[PDB]
């Protein structure tokens, strides 16, 4: 579930950051490789519930009227 | 070094290597960050990401035994990448000096983004924002003044 929402969240960001699809393809591999390298450590350390709680929490507070500060450690 | 009053080096006049240039570019060859410590171990000496984080951690503690081992791994790691050994070790001494002051770039950046947002707003629509600034310090007469 995390892998899915993260790959697909990255797809939103990618189209916002690089709205030229030619450039998005050439700039993309670095991000996918970084994404899966991180994904591997998160899953193999065994925290997927934790990340899910927090992502949902952060999103919901954006949808509704909670601005969140820059802090994230 | 930013304004051409001294030659820019990557990072030092003697102890520099051109592979450090993309890492140190934005800071004019000055080792400022925790994350630069880690990028230098990646690029110069071929560390794993996790072993790189362990070096920066060992640099925070500053312990006797600790360094001695990594000091050796970091020497033969640079040798294996064809980078000069004495250069690699003398750069390690500078990394260790600056690691003591090294601030967390990722922590600085998250907050600095918010500073830039308050900066852009003030420049482009700086009335409402100022009103908000006044509300933030509303009860203080001195600050309001």
Query: Among residues B86, B83, B13, B100, which one has the least CA distance to residue B42?
Result: B83
C-alpha span between A57 and B39 (Å, rounded): 33
* A46 contact B CB<8A: no
Number of C-alpha atoms within 13 angstroms, CB side, residue B127? 0
Contacts of B110 in chain A (CB under 8 A): 70-72
Resolution at which this structure was determined, Å:
8.0
Instruction: Name every residue whose Cβ is closer than 8 Å to that of residue B134 and which is 6 or more positions away in sequence.
Output: B144
Min Cα distance A23 → chain B (Å) is 21
Of A37, A70, A73, the CB nearest to B114: A70
Technique that determined the structure: cryo-EM
Query: Among residues B26, B24, B28, B25, which one has the least CA distance to residue B8?
Result: B28
3-state helix vs strand vs coil in chain B, percent to 5: 70, 5, 30
C-alpha span between B13 and B46 (Å, rounded): 23
């Amino acid at each position: 579930y995390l892998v899915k929402r993260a790959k697909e969240g990255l797809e939103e960001r990618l189209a916002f950051l690089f709205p030229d699809e030619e450039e998005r393809l050439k700039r993309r591999p670095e991000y996918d490789e970084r994404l899966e390298t991180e994904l591997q450590v998160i899953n193999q350390m065994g925290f997927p519930g934790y990340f899910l709680i927090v992502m949902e929490f952060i999103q919901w507070s954006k949808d509704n009227g909670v601005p969140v500060g820059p802090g994230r450690g | 070094r930013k304004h051409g009053r001294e030659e820019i080096s990557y990072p030092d006049v003697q102890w520099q290597h051109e592979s450090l240039k993309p890492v140190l570019e934005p800071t004019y060859g000055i080792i400022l960050y925790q994350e630069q410590v880690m990028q230098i171990a990646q690029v110069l000496s071929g560390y794993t990401l996790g072993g790189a984080d362990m070096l920066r951690r060992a640099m925070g503690k500053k312990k006797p035994e600790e360094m001695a081992k990594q000091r050796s791994v970091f020497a033969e790691g640079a040798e294996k990448n064809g980078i000069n050994a004495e250069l690699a070790m003398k750069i390690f001494d500078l990394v260790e000096k600056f690691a003591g002051y090294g601030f967390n770039k990722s922590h600085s950046a998250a907050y600095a983004l918010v500073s830039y947002q308050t900066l852009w707003l003030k420049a482009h629509y700086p009335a409402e924002f100022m009103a908000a600034v006044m509300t933030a310090d509303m009860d203080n007469t001195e600050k309001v003044v």
